[PDB]
Amino acid sequence: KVFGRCELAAAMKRHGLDNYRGYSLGNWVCAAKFESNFNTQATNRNTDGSTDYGILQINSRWWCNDGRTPGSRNLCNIPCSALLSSDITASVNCAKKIVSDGNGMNAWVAWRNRCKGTDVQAWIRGCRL
Ligand code: NA
Structure with a gap:
């Protein structure tokens, strides 16, 4: 599924991500944008041979089992x-x-490099939330 921006904002809110560990919903939407372009089927191979899976590019090194890391x-x-x-x-x-x-959203390198400190509320602008 490719989510729309406000569609993904609403789904993340419904699952209680808005202000989770103090990260406003715009931070989560911004991370999803640059990790996956809102595509649930996004997979990317890391140099270490681990793979990142899904809207938030969660790494097989630590978080999920892919049988090959x-x-x-x-x-x-x-x-x-x-x-x-x-x-x-x-x-x-x-x-x-x-x-x-322990490192909050810095665990998403695309969040640190592309979202952190920016106008993240822009990501939920015009959304019915
Ligand atoms: Na694993």
């Missing part, structure tokens, strides 16, 4: 394919654990 953990206890679902429940549940891990 040696020495990896599955701290969200889910198959990585569950993060490609048109239903974002699993991706949100996992992102909550990631963002609780």
Whole structure:
């Protein structure tokens, strides 16, 4: 599924991501934009041989099991394919654990480099929320 911007904002809000660990909804929407372009089926190979899965590009090194990331953990206890679902429940549940891990949203390098400190509320402008 390719979400629309306000569609994704509404789904993230419904699953309680807005102001989760103090990150306003615009931060989550901005991260999804640059990680996945709002595409639930986005997969990208990392140099270390790990893969990033889904709207929030969650890494098989630590968070999900893909059967092919040696020495990896599955701290969200889910198959990585569950993060490609048109239903974002699993991706949100996992992102909550990631963002609780001590470095907040800096764990998303595209958030640090492209969203952090910017006008993130622009991302939920004109949305019926
Ligand atoms: Na893994």
